[PDB]
Amino acid sequence: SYDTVMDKYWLSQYVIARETYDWYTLQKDYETVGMLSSPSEGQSYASQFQGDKALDKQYGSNVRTSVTIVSIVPNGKGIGTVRFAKTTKRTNETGDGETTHWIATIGYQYVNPSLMSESARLTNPLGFNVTSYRVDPE
């Protein structure tokens, strides 16, 4: 399925943007999630970078969390399931970090792309749009 392959691409892009923590990549990841999410899901994502305990304020460049996509099942019923690993490393230090495994359940749709600017279509050509997101331990 062309649709299946394309859904997998965007679900993958979304999880990577949303679960990665990299100081030098943060603004771009943040905007990618923002652009690919509904207002409600976007504000909910953003809450982690708000306030005193905002993640960037706490970590700076001393922590990096990298994502590895393990498997993806879209279901054609507007929900996709993404299994992935997170590896967190304290950048100044050595070793390999902790790796943990998760399952993201993602509600998503595609919105008419004609209703966006050509510029916005350069980052989201198909109107991919995440309406709900949850992450649960394996």
Side-chain angles (χ1 to χ4, degrees):
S1 208
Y2 177 101
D3 284 330
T4 292
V5 174
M6 191 57 62
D7 294 351
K8 286 179 177 184
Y9 176 75
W10 291 109
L11 291 165
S12 175
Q13 291 287 296
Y14 188 85
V15 170
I16 290 167
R18 175 148 183 178
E19 301 296 340
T20 298
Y21 182 89
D22 188 342
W23 175 266
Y24 300 99
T25 260
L26 189 50
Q27 193 192 337
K28 180 207 142 197
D29 286 342
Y30 183 95
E31 295 184 352
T32 298
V33 175
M35 294 285 284
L36 302 182
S37 296
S38 66
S40 74
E41 193 46 58
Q43 55 141 210
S44 177
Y45 162 72
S47 66
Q48 64 184 81
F49 302 101
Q50 268 159 20
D52 280 318
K53 270 211 185 284
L55 277 178
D56 54 339
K57 297 308 198 174
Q58 270 192 74
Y59 296 170
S61 38
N62 312 327
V63 184
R64 173 169 168 147
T65 297
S66 61
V67 175
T68 300
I69 298 298
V70 171
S71 71
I72 299 181
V73 177
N75 92 329
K77 317 213 164 192
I79 303 153
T81 300
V82 176
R83 290 147 179 279
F84 67 97
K86 263 155 119 243
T87 305
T88 297
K89 263 190 204 189
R90 263 105 225 248
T91 78
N92 271 314
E93 191 187 280
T94 217
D96 298 319
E98 348 182 341
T99 296
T100 156
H101 297 263
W102 308 87
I103 306 176
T105 302
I106 305 173
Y108 68 99
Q109 55 180 356
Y110 290 91
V111 164
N112 186 345
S114 66
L115 281 164
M116 70 195 108
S117 46
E118 189 179 357
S119 161
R121 274 191 302 275
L122 286 182
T123 45
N124 190 9
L126 296 181
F128 180 77
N129 182 240
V130 169
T131 50
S132 69
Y133 184 81
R134 60 176 296 171
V135 182
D136 298 296
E138 261 295 359

